[PDB]
């Protein structure tokens, strides 16, 4: 590709339970799960430098990880939160 | 043994009081106590270096202590919290 290509992201969502509806303020609350997947060669690492096949980050948002590793990542938000 | 073995953890829980039930949002609240116990030789120390028989950490979660001492510990969570 002579021109740069946009990275392709796969997304999925599931709903577990609707836990409340407010008819005067017009809002509702929901419980569910979210999943994202993408492929980026810039995040690759060499196994011999960690002795492991998986590198993980816990209890952090995508924005925080992006600011820690200084690479662009696909951050997201809920529109009507 | 030739292959590595998992560490064995002992657990116990007690319930003191049920303090509320929500019939519209379908949740309840409870007060109780939790206890964990395990054995790991990597946590051992030499008494002559502290003059003490017990080393303690207070007001911290297991994850925080694991991040402070840089050793794997059995962290836990409540599934429906």
Automatic annotation (TrEMBL), chains A, B:
Disulfide bonds: 50-52
Residues that bind Ca(2+) 5: 26
Binding site for Ca(2+) 3: 26
Amino-acid positions noted as binding Ca(2+) 4 in the UniProt annotation, renumbered to this chain: 26
Domain of life: Bacteria
Protein name stated in the entry: Uncharacterized protein
Natural source organism: Desulfofustis sp. PB-SRB1
Upper lineage: Bacteria, Pseudomonadati, Thermodesulfobacteriota, Desulfobulbia, Desulfobulbales
Residues of the full protein shown: 322 to 402 of 642
């Amino acid at each position: 590709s002579v021109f740069l290509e946009s990275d392709l992201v796969t997304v999925g969502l599931a709903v577990d339970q609707i836990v409340g509806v407010d008819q005067r303020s017009e809002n509702f609350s929901v419980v569910g799960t979210l999943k994202l997947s993408w492929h980026d060669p810039k995040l690759g690492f060499s196994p011999d430098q960690c002795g492991c096949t998986v590198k993980s980050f816990e209890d952090a948002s995508i924005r925080a990880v992006a600011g820690e590793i200084n690479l662009p990542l696909p951050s997201f938000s809920f529109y009507n939160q």
